Design a protein around this ligand. Structure first.
Ligand SMILES: NC(=O)C1=CN([C@@H]2O[C@H](COP(=O)(O)OP(=O)(O)OC[C@H]3O[C@@H](n4cnc5c(N)ncnc54)[C@H](OP(=O)(O)O)[C@@H]3O)[C@@H](O)[C@H]2O)C=CC1
Ligand SMILES: NC(=O)C1=CN([C@@H]2O[C@H](COP(=O)(O)OP(=O)(O)OC[C@H]3O[C@@H](n4cnc5c(N)ncnc54)[C@H](OP(=O)(O)O)[C@@H]3O)[C@@H](O)[C@H]2O)C=CC1
Ligand SMILES: Nc1nc(N)c2nc(CNc3ccc(C(=O)N[C@@H](CCC(=O)O)C(=O)O)cc3)cnc2n1
Ligand SMILES: Nc1nc(N)c2nc(CNc3ccc(C(=O)N[C@@H](CCC(=O)O)C(=O)O)cc3)cnc2n1
Ligand SMILES: Nc1nc2[nH]c3cccc(Sc4ccccc4)c3c2c(=O)[nH]1
Ligand SMILES: Nc1nc2[nH]c3cccc(Sc4ccccc4)c3c2c(=O)[nH]1
Ligand SMILES: O=c1ccn([C@H]2C[C@H](O)[C@@H](COP(=O)(O)O)O2)c(=O)[nH]1
Ligand SMILES: O=c1ccn([C@H]2C[C@H](O)[C@@H](COP(=O)(O)O)O2)c(=O)[nH]1
Lengths: 489, 491
């Protein structure tokens, strides 16, 4: 008699309003709902849930229906509705399904539910009916039997609404090839949330990367003196067609991403412009003491030299200081990339580099993310690869995933393309030794659905220089807590 | 009654000389032989094989030994051996292994052999005893039941000898999740696969072969610069191990002399393609004709001048280009010197990179670099690894050549920096097969890989700097590729 709950709920456990659904139509959720409930199977719904459904759908085709009212033409309650399933139906009736509140809370208190099939809607919506609070509730937001997630899907979206699917549970042909495999094969491996067998969420790539570097990396020294554990040659890829990979296992500093990127695009080399908006990510690397450690006593405090964005907009131009005007100097790699994207998308030379050996000594830091390449296919879908030489997995990586994915949206939009994928290529890939305990905590967190990032005022924005800080909404971002990690300078 | 043969052979099926083994000691192969034959099992050998084995090892421990001979103290033939095994031994005797020539040929004629366990020694050695010709032979060299390979390992080595293991054969919570998986598979013809019969695909060349299947089945058809038209994917990865052997691909013959000459040309900083052409390496010629130079708006270029590309940017990044005849010594950044310098002094530095992509000089080049960046890494055991990023990749023609080129550079660099080469890592942008290469590539996919060769640097003693290497300082050892497959270059 094991029973399974099938629900869609917002992060605050919201499920409905005005005897109806809080959110516009979720197509894929519906496909999911259909498939799960038939393989005959029994669905069991509360009085009012039956009404919510439009009549042409009301008898749920190819499934035994049950309503639990006391006033309609069908059982008196849930315990008596289980009886009906044992008494008759014992033949054919495979697994059962409960599909409104009060019928959910009924099933929880009577403790007959072994599994929960939960569509996590990432947005909050006005609601007047809620799913009961339960142990394992953390899977929804930051709010002895308990419900442990065993499955977590990729992020989907419909009508501007991001959503995940999770499932929670109460807690000699070629055997004569084996002796050879045996001898070819081989202390305590950490794994990100080991209880999740089916790891669809694309954020597992980042969580499994962290595990790999800690289990199989090699302890090394470095420029900073802090010490690392590293690997070399690592790969992640993030899909941009449904959702946006803003990491959920720790809050990513979104404003910083978006400001630094707009700062790159103007070709600005004054870190003070970032700092004065409360984005201090450059400050430790442009202090007097650090410019002097870089043999650049002539540099003003804040001046990053001819770095990142200077090279994007003015490659090979002679650098002076951060107040000087370079308009018309060097190669504008960004405009050329866009022009080629608009006029000839099959060209294979759509690249932008930040690596200029002639100028490395003049920069505060040698660039980390130093190359990106764009690719269009035959459906007008755009993808981007970025090659990063040196990757602080703790701190920089999540920020960088966001940064370059956002640039892919920005470029897709001015070129009249749909963004498809971000491909992340990593060289020296390291975890600072003093971030390890923090990262082990992070690996005990189950990811939440990815948000969507929208571009507002699309009508106004025609060229890449037209974007401002106020032209993006992040929708449905529900991360776990910030985890503090000190920057190795 | 099924039997298994266990052998090690050269490419010409050579197994013995002077009642001994042809090659120096192969440790892993001995491990392999021991682990396969005990799990009690019986081994069956010919008299002369019994006598090959040193005496301290002689009765092979923990195995029933049977010798076929007519002189000793033991059965008179193979049929007689298999009778022995059935009459007594039916208990605890699990599998039976045949381990000399002529015992191998009797076992193949009788037809009682179900699996062959063949260790493929990649070098030839003087041999006076051979393993019989058998259908499936083609796994060894370019020389009805057939023995088809089902398992093919990675390449190993010991004492300067590269080798493979292949195996031939005669011819609660799950339940609940199943439905949610079921619909995420559904949405979304006849898949092409490289040697599908091969179930355990350790040979690192399966990376290249599976990359060709993947582009063909899942890539999108597009136009391009050339007019020829391609199938493409975006963002592809391979990695090749360098500690044991060298990834010179075996499913078609790769042009070693071209790899090596071009790489040396790169290191010199040379931009004259005539110097390549004059040594019988014409890979640059179609891209430096008078005709191709004008279609690039460079009528002032002498035929063969590739402009300030590859090696020019490596040795003189940003220097002002004139022509292929000028001396640039001292001008621009010598990225290669710097990388080496950093590897010798500071192996944990994370800025060990070299790029040929210079957007200020791209129009002046005949061709924008394809392989445009490489970065180096040293771990805690003095092992050098290398990543190269290639923006555009002709999977049919250039990729194998590109794999060998940067792998060789890795060796060259590791040697002058006193490191051991470990791994070459290939990062690929626009990754594509030309449409007129497809039929040929599908043929190529029917060919199982052979063990990789080793590349030795000769005259290590005299070679202290990167500019010291010449064409005569390398040997390729044990290279046994399949035939060339002619594929024309899309101009
Ligand atoms: N997104 C989702 O996952 C889902 C959302 N919904 C939404 O939620 C709302 C419907 O849920 P809700 O309002 O809670 O109403 P329900 O559908 O749970 O129906 C409540 C009625 O069912 C009967 N009932 C429920 N529990 C008991 C009990 N323990 N003992 C006896 N009878 C019981 C009663 O009928 P009687 O009055 O006859 O005694 C009660 O009036 C709608 O807005 C609907 O759209 C519904 C299903 C799923
Ligand atoms: N690398 C490898 O895979 C292996 C290599 N080897 C090498 O091969 C050589 C040994 O092979 P090889 O020279 O062929 O000799 P074998 O070991 O096959 O033995 C030859 C002798 O065994 C007996 N014999 C063999 N076949 C028959 C038969 N069909 N019927 C009756 N008696 C038979 C005969 O002994 P009698 O004179 O008593 O009648 C014959 O003279 C050595 O150099 C050895 O190191 C051996 C094993 C493995
Ligand atoms: N995870 C999740 N997501 C939900 N939306 C959900 N909704 C409810 C209740 N609300 C309903 C709304 C519409 C229908 C309806 O007409 N459905 C057709 C759709 C067929 C198709 O489109 O394939 C069907 O069932 O074949 C049924 C119930 C209960 N649990 C739920 N759980
Ligand atoms: N594929 C293959 N490779 C071969 N070399 C091979 N050689 C022969 C004959 N030559 C032999 C010489 C010495 C031994 C010996 O003392 N071996 C130890 C290894 C101990 C260990 O390291 O475990 C053992 O097994 O305990 C065994 C065989 C026959 N078939 C063969 N087949
Ligand atoms: N060790 C370390 N040094 C960094 N310097 C940066 C400069 C700009 C952006 C970044 S990315 C970043 C910035 C703030 C917080 C996390 C990543 C870094 C960065 C980083 O991530 N790690
Ligand atoms: N389509 C295609 N065009 C090429 N132009 C080249 C110029 C120099 C080296 C190369 S590599 C190469 C290796 C073997 C044969 C031809 C080119 C290419 C090359 C290639 O491989 N494919
Ligand atoms: O976007 C960025 C910029 C910088 N870094 C960090 C990675 C290195 O830990 C740090 C120092 O660079 P190196 O000089 O060590 O490469 O820069 C990032 O991770 N992401
Ligand atoms: O080492 C090389 C050099 C060139 N090419 C090929 C890849 C491209 O198919 C062709 C030129 O096309 P574009 O990169 O120009 O699109 O050069 C390679 O594959 N490998």
């Amino acid at each position: 008699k094991p029973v399974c709950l099938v629900v869609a709920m917002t992060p605050k456990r919201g499920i409905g309003i005005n005897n109806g659904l809080p959110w516009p139509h979720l197509t894929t959720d519906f496909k999911h709902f259909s498939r799960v409930t038939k393989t005959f199977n029994a669905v069991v719904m509360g009085r009012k849930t039956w009404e919510s459904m439009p009549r042409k759908f009301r008898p749920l085709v190819d499934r035994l229906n049950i309503v639990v009212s006391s006033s309609l033409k069908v059982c008196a309650s849930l315990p008596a509705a289980l009886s009906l399933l044992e008494e008759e139906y014992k033949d054919s009736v495979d697994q059962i399904f409960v599909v409104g509140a009060g019928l959910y809370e009924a099933a929880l208190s009577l403790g007959v539910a072994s599994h929960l099939y939960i569509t996590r809607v990432a947005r909050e919506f006005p609601c007047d009916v809620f799913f009961p609070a339960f142990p394992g509730d953390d899977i929804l937001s930051n709010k002895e039997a308990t419900y442990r997630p065993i499955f977590i899907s990729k992020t989907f979206s419909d009508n501007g609404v991001p959503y995940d699917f999770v499932v929670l549970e109460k807690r000699s042909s070629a055997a004569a090839i084996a002796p050879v495999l045996a001898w070819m094969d081989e202390k305590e491996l950490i794994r990100a949330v080991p209880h999740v067998h089916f790891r669809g969420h694309e954020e597992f790539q980042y969580l499994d990367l962290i595990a790999d570097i800690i289990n199989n990396g090699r302890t090394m020294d470095d420029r900073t003196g802090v010490g690392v554990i590293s690997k070399f040659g690592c790969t992640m890829r993030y899909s941009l067609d449904q959702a946006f990979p803003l990491l959920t296992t720790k809050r990513v500093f979104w404003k910083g991403v978006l400001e630094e990127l707009l700062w790159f695009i103007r070709g600005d080399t004054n870190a003070n412009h970032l700092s004065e908006k409360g984005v201090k990510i450059w400050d430790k690397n442009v202090t007097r003491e650090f410019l002097d450690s870089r043999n650049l006593p002539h540099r003003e405090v804040g001046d990053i030299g001819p770095g990142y964005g200077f090279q994007w907009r003015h490659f090979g131009a002679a650098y002076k200081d951060m107040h000087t005007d370079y308009t018309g100097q060097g190669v504008d790699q960004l405009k050329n990339v866009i022009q080629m994207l608009r006029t000839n998308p099959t060209d294979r030379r759509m690249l932008m580099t930040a690596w200029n050996p002639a100028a490395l000594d003049e920069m505060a830091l040698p660039p980390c993310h130093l190359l990106c390449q764009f690719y269009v296919n035959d459906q007008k879908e755009l993808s981007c690869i970025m090659y990063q030489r040196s990757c602080d997995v703790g701190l920089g990586v999540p920020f960088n995933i966001a940064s370059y994915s956002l640039l892919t949206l920005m470029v897709a939009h001015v070129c009249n393309l749909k963004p498809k994928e971000f491909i992340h290529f990593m060289g020296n890939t390291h975890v600072y030794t003093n971030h390890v305990e923090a990262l082990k905590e992070q690996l005990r967190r189950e990811p939440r659905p990815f948000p969507i990032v929208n571009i507002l005022n699309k009508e106004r924005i025609k060229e890449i220089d037209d974007f401002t800080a106020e032209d993006f909404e992040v929708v449905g971002y529900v991360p776990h807590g910030r985890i503090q990690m000190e920057m190795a300078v």
